RNA sequence: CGUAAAGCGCACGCAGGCGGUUUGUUAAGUCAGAUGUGAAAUCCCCGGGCUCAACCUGGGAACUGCAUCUGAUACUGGCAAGCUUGAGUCUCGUAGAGGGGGGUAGAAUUCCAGGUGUAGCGGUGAAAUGCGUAGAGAUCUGGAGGAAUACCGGUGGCGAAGGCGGCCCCCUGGACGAAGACUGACGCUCAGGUGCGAAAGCGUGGGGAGCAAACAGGAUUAGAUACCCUGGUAGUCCACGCCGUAAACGAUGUCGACUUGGAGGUUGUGCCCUUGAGGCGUGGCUUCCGGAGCUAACGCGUUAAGUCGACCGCCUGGGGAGUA
């Protein structure tokens, strides 16, 4: 699911450092990466509910990473959604 | 202090938590007691029995297992205080008012059978009283002399005689128990780490107690 | 999730006293020793010592007159659910006044019995008996 | 609040409540002293006055408060800067009836067509219904279908819960362990809200072997709108919608800390001798028995009903009624 190579590009273009595995904006980006893909399995296969519970985890969890950022570095949050085209 | 190679530590894979201080652990999943925090311990055990012993004490030895009984008998009437080796009637102490009356049956028979009243009846019928004499001798025999109530109740085990601790520590008679690394010391007054299930060890304990008991008499 | 660490620090003793432990440890914080400062200072718990530079974990040593605990009772009061502050003139007595109560003044955490005679009072934390 | 009344069936989650650790700061909460206002009578305390009393009455205390000034700064909050245990991301593997889709194989069931061949077959406590000389049942050969996956299979595993089982492939969720990396409290819970949610049932449309509500027939019985027997519609099966209730039950809310043992099971991983089915650790999950303690008892017992802390839900006699 978004295999190792697919991952590395996200951190790469969201690189504060090589092994910046854990910065937020990287995560949100990965979250974005998988979710956009995941709507590929759910366009069809709509009845696949069990997977849905997992998809929900990511979205909402990603959201929780949003609000942490906003109240911690608006320059990061504001640069972010405007480049990852968020907010419906 | 290691005068013997059989007291060292034994009894099980299934220990009992309350036996935690005094331990080494070896192969076969058998604990080996830490004799180091044993030797000092029974010394005052040996000592404390003596102070009341020298005060013309009333010491009880209780044993069972048929492989622990003999040494006790060999050691208690050795010169002095009373013992019990066969199945000790649960209640010889906390209900001694009733057991005491039993001895009147015994002291009768014990005398009658050999010079007194044993044959003014039919042999098989007169036989029945004989068994009762042995039957009384078998269990109650070791207390006949006791009278009143104890001053101390030395024992070999804690579990196999679990009925002692809950009783002896109920009228308060000071007990002295060699608890295996299996038993529960809770009620025992002077908990002596050691082995029950041995024989060369137990006659050492008896032999250990046999010493100062022989001084107490005064 | 471990929202009242002091409650926990109170908790540990009551349990350690139950199981005849010898010493108990915890993620020691600035506050935790302050309470510990008192407890030892009045003699309910034997000596404390703290090791650490990144994981400072105090080890409070208990105490026993007999095998029974010496802390017959201990009780977290000021809950994060419910802060309760009492005035100088409002300070209660615990165990006819012989059991002590740990209160927080503006002179630092200190037994009410001594904080009473500092002439002021504040947040009550726990009791002991 | 396991069984007595009472943990929503389960999950995500906004408001709300609560929050790890370090330093500085601020002074909201908190706190000390003071100040003003807190009407009197009434209540209380020592008095006093009617012969006493009730009653009157002097003086004090008190009126648990509110606003302001002045500070105290532990704790709590705001704000600023951190830190790593909480939490989360990546590197690599491992196990799994997790979920959806699309193929597929064997066994049997009934059916239908042939060959053979002949009076029963089926059934029951004993019968009859029914099927059969227009030739069954039996056996052989073959085809057509539908639904379920023996053995493996196990107080095994997986999933939030409902639930999940032949094999294969594609799509896809979660979990666990290693040695490190990295963000640096990003948390815990959550009325309302959203979603899921056995079975039976509803609606539209496909299927229909077996099973089978309803119903039919034969029996049983005193009667037998049943228990039994022969059949049999819906239904169950598939798709898409719907319903949202169940003894949706470990009758045990969620998260977290702590608190003596024993014996198995399952699944990772470190080491010693794999020197030979091993021996010694370290983690996840799980089964029975059990100690302190707890509970009304029964029992729970490191996965507590023990010891606390955060948040929610819920109870307040029986029937009436889970009804109007």
From Swiss-Prot, chain A:
Family under the similarity heading: Belongs to the universal ribosomal protein uS15 family.
Functional summary from the UniProt entry: One of the primary rRNA binding proteins, it binds directly to 16S rRNA where it helps nucleate assembly of the platform of the 30S subunit by binding and bridging several RNA helices of the 16S rRNA. Binds to its own mRNA, stabilizing it 5-UTR and preventing its translation. In the E.coli 70S ribosome it has been modeled to contact the 23S rRNA of the 50S subunit forming part of bridge B4. In the two 3.5 A resolved ribosome structures there are minor differences between side-chain conformations.
SUPFAM superfamilies given in the database record: S15/NS1 RNA-binding domain (SSF47060)
Entry keyword set: Ribonucleoprotein, Ribosomal protein, RNA-binding, rRNA-binding, Translation regulation
Induction data: Part of the metY operon that extends to pnp, also has its own promoter.
Transmembrane segments: none
PROSITE patterns per the UniProt record, alphabetical: RIBOSOMAL_S15
CDD domains in alphabetical order: Ribosomal_S15p_S13e
A GO molecular-function descriptor: rRNA binding
Taxonomic lineage: Bacteria, Pseudomonadati, Pseudomonadota, Gammaproteobacteria, Enterobacterales
InterPro entries: Ribosomal_uS15, Ribosomal_uS15_bac-type, uS15_NS1_RNA-bd_sf
Gene Ontology BP term (one): cytoplasmic translation
Recorded GO CC terms: cytoplasm; cytosol; cytosolic small ribosomal subunit
Keyword Ribonucleoprotein: yes
Record protein name field: Small ribosomal subunit protein uS15
SMART domains: Ribosomal_S15
Record's subunit section: Part of the 30S ribosomal subunit. Forms a bridge to the 50S subunit in the 70S ribosome, contacting the 23S rRNA.
Pfam families: Ribosomal_S15
Originating organism: Escherichia coli (strain K12)
From Swiss-Prot, chain B:
Cellular component, GO, one term: cytosolic small ribosomal subunit
Pfam family, one: Ribosomal_S2
GO biological process, one term: ribosomal small subunit assembly
GO molecular function terms noted in the UniProt entry: structural constituent of ribosome; zinc ion binding
Entry-annotated residues carrying N6-succinyllysine: 107
Entry keywords, A to Z: Ribonucleoprotein, Ribosomal protein
Name of the protein in question: Small ribosomal subunit protein uS2
Organism of origin: Escherichia coli (strain K12)
Curated annotation (Swiss-Prot), chain C:
Superkingdom in the source lineage: Bacteria
GO process terms (BP): cytoplasmic translation; regulation of mRNA stability; regulation of translation; ribosomal small subunit assembly
GO cellular component entries: cytoplasm; cytosol; cytosolic small ribosomal subunit
NCBIfam families to which the protein is assigned, alphabetical: PRK00136.1
Similarity comment text for this entry: Belongs to the universal ribosomal protein uS8 family.
Quaternary structure annotation from Swiss-Prot or TrEMBL: Part of the 30S ribosomal subunit. Contacts proteins S5 and S12.
Name listed for the protein in its UniProt record: Small ribosomal subunit protein uS8
Organism: Escherichia coli (strain K12)
Record gene name: rpsH
């Amino acid at each position: 699911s978004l295999s190792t190579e697919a991952t590395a590009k996200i951190v790469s273009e969201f690189g504060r450092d090589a092994n910046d595995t854990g910065s937020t904006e990287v995560q949100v980006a990965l979250l974005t990466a998988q979710i956009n893909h995941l709507q590929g399995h759910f366009a069809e296969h709509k009845k696949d509910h069990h997977s849905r519970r997992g998809l929900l985890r990511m979205v909402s969890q990603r959201r929780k990473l949003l609000d942490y950022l906003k109240r911690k570095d608006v320059a990061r949050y504001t640069q972010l959604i405007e480049r990852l085209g968020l907010r419906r | 202090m290691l005068k013997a190679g059989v007291h060292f530590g034994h009894q099980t894979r299934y220990w009992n938590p309350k036996m935690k201080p005094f331990i080494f652990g070896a192969r076969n999943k058998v604990h080996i007691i830490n004799l180091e925090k044993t030797v000092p311990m029974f010394n005052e055990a040996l000592a404390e029995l003596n102070k009341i012993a020298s005060r013309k004490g009333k010491i009880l030895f209780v044993g069972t297992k048929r492989a622990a009984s003999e040494a006790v008998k060999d050691a208690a009437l050795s010169c002095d205080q009373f013992f019990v080796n066969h199945r000790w009637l649960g209640g010889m102490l906390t209900n001694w008012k009733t057991v005491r009356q039993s001895i009147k049956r015994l002291k009768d028979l014990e005398t009658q059978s050999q010079d007194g009243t044993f044959d003014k009846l039919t042999k098989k019928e007169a036989l029945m009283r004989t068994r009762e004499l042995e039957k009384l001798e078998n269990s109650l025999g070791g207390i006949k002399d006791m009278g009143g109530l104890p001053d101390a109740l030395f024992v070999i085990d804690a579990d196999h005689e679990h009925i002692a601790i809950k009783e002896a520590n109920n009228l308060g008679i000071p007990v002295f128990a060699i608890v295996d690394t299996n038993s529960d010391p809770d009620g025992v007054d002077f908990v002596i780490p050691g082995n029950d299930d041995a024989i060369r060890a137990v006659t050492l304990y008896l032999g250990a107690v046999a010493a100062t008991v022989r001084e107490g008499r005064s | 999730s471990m929202q009242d660490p002091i409650a926990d620090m109170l908790t540990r003793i009551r349990n350690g006293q139950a199981a005849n432990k010898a010493a108990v440890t915890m993620p020691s914080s600035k506050l935790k020793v302050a309470i510990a400062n008192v407890l030892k200072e009045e003699g309910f718990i034997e000596d404390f010592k703290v090791e650490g530079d990144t994981k400072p974990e105090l080890e409070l040593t208990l105490k026993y007159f007999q095998g029974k605990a010496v802390v017959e009772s201990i009780q977290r009061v000021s809950r994060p659910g419910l802060r309760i502050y009492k005035r100088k003139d409002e300070l209660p007595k615990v165990m006819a006044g012989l059991g002590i109560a740990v209160v927080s003044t503006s002179k630092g955490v200190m037994t009410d019995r001594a904080a009473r005679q500092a002439g002021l009072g504040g947040e009550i934390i726990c009791y002991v008996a």
